[PDB]
Design an enzyme around this catalytic site. Structure first.
Site: not given
Lengths: 193, 193
Positions: A22, A70, A95, A116
């Site tokens: 991520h 997020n 990513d 997100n």
């Protein structure tokens, strides 16, 4: 302008996340910063780490949100507003589950695609920024996604991602000079050697 | 004074973290809240989710920081300050690498033990709060810790942890009624096998 003047890398802060999939956007922007000798400094006003310097004859700002993934818009939005940087001049590296390791593409506009970090940005600045989609592979079911994105890749997959990132770094000159269609063609054509 | 009046559960927000080992503290406090019919509500002033209600004849507050683990003190500190809750009246439930799944202990004082949620709390309120240490096992090297704590346990390990948590829940009455040494003895005697 057409020129990219802000390059954002998405990721999560801290050593516990630094090698996870991520964080592919952090990898790109950290590497870009050091390639051009641009220092990334703590920037608590905008809940991130940021820097500014010359890339290929243009004055470019670099930003890593320190908000966690997020909540990335808590950094990107006020930072871009304060510096009066339009979305069209922003590149966000992230990513991409929907592309394999070793695949990398530049996209303009569209939605978050279930990412997100992008989900926290698109509502506020709109969709019309550029994205550097760094493939990380999809593990094959929704329930496996969390452990994949919060996991470290095995070394063969990491090498594929690193090669793709290296290629994109070589095309940043086109982006900061405003040659986006050429950058897209040249980035998107990458295949591992 | 001695009677526990605030019970904190440590963890990370969001469905992508809900089943991960590092959320063992959230497990405990979510389960405690529903056992007593105490609603956990969004509490943005204190960067958390909180509730308050009657547990075994005492008015107890429940708090889940929504700061992410390593910033838990951003919730716990102002919350405890605003309600004037002294450390000795606080119980913080957290995952413990240094105990196996199924092991659970109540501890008073000491340091963070390398737990990065407690690391964010101890500097501000001091060490003299109580801890419910929920064993999650250790993966055997420092580099494997992140994937362990940000990973979902297999079902055999999850059963062991759940049984330990159930046992601790059964002893909350002793804690909130100010019988901490008896709670310690009865919690720490739990045998998962």
């Amino acid at each position: 302008m057409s020129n990219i003047s802000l390059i954002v890398g998405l990721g999560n802060p801290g050593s516990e996340y630094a090698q996870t999939r991520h964080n592919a956007g952090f990898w790109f922007v950290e590497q870009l910063a050091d390639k051009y000798g641009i220092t990334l400094k703590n920037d608590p006003k905008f809940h991130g780490i940021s820097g500014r310097g010359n890339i290929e004859g243009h004055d470019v700002r670099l930003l890593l949100p320190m908000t966690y993934m997020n909540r990335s818009g808590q950094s990107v939005v006020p930072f871009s507003k304060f510096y009066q940087i339009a979305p069209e001049a922003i590149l966000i590296a992230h990513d991409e589950l929907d592309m394999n390791p070793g695949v990398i593409r530049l996209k303009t506009g569209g939605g978050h695609g279930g990412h997100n970090g992008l989900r926290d940005i698109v509502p506020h600045i709109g969709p019309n920024f550029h994205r550097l989609r760094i493939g990380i592979g999809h593990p094959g079911s929704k329930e496996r996604v969390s452990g994949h994105v919060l996991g470290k890749a095995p070394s063969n997959e990491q090498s594929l991602m690193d090669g793709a990132i290296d290629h994109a770094l070589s095309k940043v000159k086109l982006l900061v000079q405003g040659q986006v269609p050429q950058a897209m063609n040249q980035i998107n054509a990458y295949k591992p050697a």
